[PDB]
């Protein structure tokens, strides 16, 4: 799914991902952009064998179970494929769980590198929020 800026933003809004842990929506939208160019079905494989899933490219070594990762866990208690869908609630509910752990949204290297310290409103400017 190729979500629009305002489409995706509207979704992320109703799923209460605004000020979630005191982070404005544009933070989420931007992170989705630079992490998976809004493609709810992107997957980037990694060195240790781990694979990143969905909208907010959530990794299999600790957040999901794909049953292919010769390593560790599943803190989000959800099978990876659940994250690869047009309905980003699985990814957005799991996301809430990652952001609850100290680093907050620092986990999203792409957020951090291109969105911590930017005009985030910039991404929700124009929408029917």
UniProtKB/Swiss-Prot annotation:
Keyword Disulfide bond assigned: yes
This protein's GO CC annotations: cytoplasm; extracellular space
Entries under InterPro entries matching the protein: Glyco_hydro_22, Glyco_hydro_22_CS, Glyco_hydro_22_lys, Lysozyme-like_dom_sf
The enzyme's E.C. designation: 3.2.1.17
C-type lysozyme domain span: 1-129
Keywords associated with the record: Antimicrobial, Bacteriolytic enzyme, Disulfide bond, Glycosidase, Hydrolase, Secreted, Signal
Gene Ontology MF term list: glycosaminoglycan binding; identical protein binding; lysozyme activity
Catalytic activity: Hydrolysis of (1->4)-beta-linkages between N-acetylmuramic acid and N-acetyl-D-glucosamine residues in a peptidoglycan and between N-acetyl-D-glucosamine residues in chitodextrins
CDD domains, A to Z: LYZ_C
Matches recorded under Pfam families: Lys (PF00062)
EC class of the enzyme, as a word: hydrolase
SMART domains in the record: LYZ1
GO biological process: cell wall macromolecule catabolic process; defense response to Gram-negative bacterium; defense response to Gram-positive bacterium; killing of cells of another organism
Compartments where located: Secreted
Hydrolase found in the keyword field: yes
Cystine pairs: 6-127, 30-115, 64-80, 76-94
Other observations noted: Lysozyme C is capable of both hydrolysis and transglycosylation; it also shows a slight esterase activity. It acts rapidly on both peptide-substituted and unsubstituted peptidoglycan, and slowly on chitin oligosaccharides.
PANTHER family, sorted: LYSOZYME C (PTHR11407:SF28)
Self-association and partners: Monomer.
Family that this chain belongs to: Belongs to the glycosyl hydrolase 22 family.
Free-text function comment from the UniProt entry: Lysozymes have primarily a bacteriolytic function; those in tissues and body fluids are associated with the monocyte-macrophage system and enhance the activity of immunoagents.
Name of the featured protein: Lysozyme C
Native source organism of the sequence: Meleagris gallopavo
């Amino acid at each position: 799914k190729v979500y629009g800026r305002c489409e995706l933003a509207a979704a992320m809004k109703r799923l209460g991902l605004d000020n979630y842990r005191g982070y404005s929506l544009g933070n989420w939208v931007c992170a989705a952009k630079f992490e998976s160019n809004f493609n709810t079905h992107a997957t980037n494989r990694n060195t240790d064998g781990s694979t990143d899933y969905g909208i907010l490219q959530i990794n299999s070594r600790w957040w999901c179970n794909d049953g292919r990762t010769p390593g560790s866990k599943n803190l989000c208690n959800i099978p990876c494929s659940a994250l690869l869908s047009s309905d980003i609630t699985a990814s957005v509910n799991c996301a809430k769980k990652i952001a609850s752990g100290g680093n907050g949204m620092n986990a999203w290297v792409a957020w951090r590198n291109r969105c911590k310290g930017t005009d985030v409103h910039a991404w929700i400017r124009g929408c029917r929020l």
